[PDB]
Amino acid sequence: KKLDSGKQIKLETTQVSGNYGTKNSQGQIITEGNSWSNYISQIDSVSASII
Amino acid sequence: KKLDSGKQIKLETTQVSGNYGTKNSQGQIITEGNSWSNYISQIDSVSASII
Amino acid sequence: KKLDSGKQIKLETTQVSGNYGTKNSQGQIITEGNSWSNYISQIDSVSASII
Amino acid sequence: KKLDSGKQIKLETTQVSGNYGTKNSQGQIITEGNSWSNYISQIDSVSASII
Amino acid sequence: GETLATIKAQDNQIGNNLSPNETYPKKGLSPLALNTMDQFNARLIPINYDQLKKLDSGKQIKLETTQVSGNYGTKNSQGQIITEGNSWSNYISQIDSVSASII
Amino acid sequence: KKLDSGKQIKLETTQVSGNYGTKNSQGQIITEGNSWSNYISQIDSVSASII
Amino acid sequence: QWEKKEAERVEKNLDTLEKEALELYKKDSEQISNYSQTRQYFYDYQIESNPREKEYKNLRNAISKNKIDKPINVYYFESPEKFAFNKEIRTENQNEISLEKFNELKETIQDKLFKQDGFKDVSLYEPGNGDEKPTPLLIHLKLPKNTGMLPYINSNDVKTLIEQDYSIKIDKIVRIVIEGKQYIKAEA
Amino acid sequence: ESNTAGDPYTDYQKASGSIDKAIKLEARDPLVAAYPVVGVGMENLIISTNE
Ligand SMILES: [Ca+2]
């Protein structure tokens, strides 16, 4: 009933999960055990933000 | 019916599960099999708690 | 219909399963392959009970 | 209808599966890969059964 | 003259041991129940109305076995017996090729 | 109701996932841990597109 | 998890005779080890006639087929007479090491350059509970840039086969307690 | 080439016969490939009108 009026639904992302790639001696890239969430907090904790 | 009245629903956290990060054989951080629940009872058992 | 009378539901615990902690090839505590059910029968058959 | 009469439901055990304990490289008892069905036939084929 | 269903035996119908010259269940017990058709034993075997009206006559349902899966026994690094990754269908074709059958 | 008119449904492929093969010194080909997604971004960054 | 995956993956992109040398390593570890240590002290015809040379160099190329990208810390046990200490630190059924033996060892292993040779299996983590510890001396080594390491599996664990064309330099020895025994951890 | 015919077995394995014994002897020639050609044929179709 709210929706059948001026009311709009908003969307906000609370987190994003994804992988990074790591090569080897050759160009073999693997992106499975590699999780960005392991480094998000560590990067935020030693950095300065510039936008 | 009890909820269409002054009665409210409270919410209580009985426990919280999670992970900690360690560096594996190389400089990669792993948080998969590292569970905090293995260390809760042991930390509480040898400590004083200050708040 | 029994329950809407003096009849009550009782609760009996037949068994409980859980883990124990051991140090792995690192300083980390592991409680995954460790199962108390492997030792419940062995301890009972070598000991005396005291309460 | 056959059961709302003098007739009863009988129960027959056709097989039972289970594990056995084995001490692994360290002092831990393991009962996971160990199955008695691997030895039921072998035992029944070299033995006399006394009751 | 038509196949109603092809059923593979799930957990409820798998026989843990079967020695030669024996049965499952054993000689003194009553037969299994082949009730379900899905993988998790939660979906029964249906027929439609024409097949049910056909069953309400002399027509009988026959059962043919098209294959059997099963394991064999091997000893691992220790003296244990492992029958898990040891399939018989890996050798069913090879044995039938280099052999003469005698019954 | 909109589709029971001149309206058609279009189809847009947004991404494709698939494997590649890697031979040993014999002809043993494996196509499991081999994802083209690991290399799509890297190829599209060091290249020039010709059609 | 990581070492299991990478080890089981290297055991496919090996050449058939390389896997031959690797599997006949799990049979003649001592013999092919000693022969890798002492192969080069013959005549040439005494070299290319020896039936172990095939597997020897096949295994060597298998090892050098995967060189690391950054320094690594490895751990492995060693006998004291490998370092000219021709006495016993303590017999492995004893639990203590005397200050006298500690001082003697420190005096005799501080000022030399011990050349190494042949193949050897190592680990990437210190010994724990369940691992075999036959010798009192634990060598903590640092393998540098571009040193062949081959991870193989004895059906339950992982070993790192390396070849030794270096010379180890002892820095400091300390006496360690593990499981109620006294070992020696020497940094090399 | 170790696999001339492009199939999973090498030239020596096919020539000597150190392969699946159910493989036709045609495919024991390093130029002829071990290759299954499987196809399905429908025999009759049953319709179940669920009124
Ligand atoms: Ca060839």
* SS3 at position G52: helix
The boundaries of the domain holding residue E12 are: 1-98
Binding site annotation covers H43?
Answer: no
Q: How far is the CA of H23 from the centre of ligand 1 (A)?
A: 20
**b/e sequence H19-36, b meaning 16+ C-beta within 10 Å:** beeebeeebbebeebbee
Q: Residue H34 gets which letter from DSSP?
A: P
* Residues 6+ positions from E96 with CB-CB distance below 8 Å: H22
Of G161, G164, G150, give the one whose Cα is nearest residue G82.
Answer: G164
Q: Would E46 be classed as within a structural domain? A: yes
Total tally of structural domains belonging to chain G: 1
**Number of neighbours of residue G100 by Cβ within 10 angstroms:** 8
* Residues 6+ positions from G183 with CB-CB distance below 8 Å: G133, G136, G137, G138, G175, G176, G177
Query: C19 with C34: CB under 8 angstroms?
Result: yes
Chain F partners within 8 Å of G12 (Cβ): 24, 28, 30
Respond yes or no on whether the N-terminal peptide bond of residue G80 is cis (omega within 30° of 0).
no
Question: Does the CB of C24 have a partner CB in chain G at under 8 Å?
Answer: yes
Q: How far is the CA of G56 from the centre of ligand 1 (A)?
A: 25
Q: In Å, what is the CA distance from G61 to each residue of E48, G66, G157?
A: 67, 9, 23
Q: Residue B36 gets which letter from DSSP?
A: G
Nearest-Å Rg of the Cα atoms of chain G is 18
**b/e sequence G34-72, b meaning 16+ C-beta within 10 Å:** ebbeebeeeeeeeeeeeebeebbebbbebbeebebeeeb
* SS3 at position E76: coil
* Token pair for B5: 């009245």
Query: G150 with G68: CB under 8 angstroms?
Result: no
Distance from CA of G140 to the nearest CA of D (A): 24
H or E stretch covering F40: helix F37-43
* Token pair for G162: 């390396």
Total tally of structural domains belonging to chain E: 1
Q: How far is the CA of H4 from the centre of ligand 1 (A)?
A: 6
> What's the sign of the alpha-carbon dihedral C36, C37, C38, C43?
positive
Query: G87 with G80: CB under 8 angstroms?
Result: yes
Query: G119 with G163: CB under 8 angstroms?
Result: yes
Binding site annotation covers H26?
Answer: no
Q: How far apart are CA G187 and CA G171, in angstroms?
A: 5
B33 DSSP β-pair partners: none
Experimental method: cryo-EM
Q: How far apart are CA C11 and CA F47, in angstroms?
A: 69
* Residues 6+ positions from H28 with CB-CB distance below 8 Å: H14, H15, H17, H19
Of G48, G111, G76, G109, give the one whose Cα is nearest residue G183.
Answer: G76
Q: How far is the CA of C39 from the centre of ligand 1 (A)?
A: 57
Q: How far apart are CA G89 and CA G97, in angstroms?
A: 7
* Token pair for E3: 């196949």
- The amino acid at H19: I
* Token pair for E41: 């034993």
- E strands, chain H, are none
Q: How far apart are CA G163 and CA G47, in angstroms?
A: 19
* Residues 6+ positions from B23 with CB-CB distance below 8 Å: B29, B30
Query: Alpha-carbon dihedral of residues G36, G42, G45, G51, nearest 10 degrees?
Result: -30
The boundaries of the domain holding residue G188 are: 1-188
* Token pair for A19: 């992988």
* Residues 6+ positions from G57 with CB-CB distance below 8 Å: none
- E strands, chain F, are 22-23, 29-30
Of E4, E5, E11, E69, give the one whose Cα is nearest residue E37.
Answer: E5
* Token pair for C30: 């592991």
For C23, the closest of G125, G128, G131 (CB atoms) is G128
Q: How far apart are CA G89 and CA G108, in angstroms?
A: 12
Q: Would E103 be classed as within a structural domain? A: no
Nearest-Å Rg of the Cα atoms of chain E is 18
Query: G176 with G128: CB under 8 angstroms?
Result: no
Of E9, E39, E5, E37, give the one whose Cα is nearest residue E24.
Answer: E9
Taking an 8 Å cut-off on Cβ atoms, the answer to whether E73 and D38 are in contact is yes
Residue G184 burial (C-beta neighbours within 10 Å; 0-12, 13-18, 19+): buried
Taking an 8 Å cut-off on Cβ atoms, the answer to whether A32 and F37 are in contact is no
Q: How far apart are CA H34 and CA H21, in angstroms?
A: 12
Distance from CA of B29 to the nearest CA of A (A): 6
Neighbours of chain F (3+ CB pairs under 8 A): A, G, H
Angle between helix axes G29-37 and G52-64 (nearest 10 degrees) is 80
Q: Would E26 be classed as within a structural domain? A: yes
* SS3 at position H6: coil
Beta-strand relationship, G181-187 and G137-143? parallel
* Residues 6+ positions from G52 with CB-CB distance below 8 Å: G31, G32, G35, G39
Which one of C31, C32, C38 makes the best mutation probe of the D interface by having the most chain D beta carbons within 10 Å? Answer: C38
Question: Does the CB of B6 have a partner CB in chain G at under 8 Å?
Answer: no
> What's the sign of the alpha-carbon dihedral E15, E17, E22, E25?
negative
Q: What is the CATH number of the domain that holds G19?
A: 3.90.176.10
Which one of C23, C24, C25 makes the best mutation probe of the G interface by having the most chain G beta carbons within 10 Å? Answer: C25
Resolution value (Å, 1 decimal)? 2.9
Token pair 């020539």 is found at H15
Q: How far apart are CA E29 and CA E6, in angstroms?
A: 26
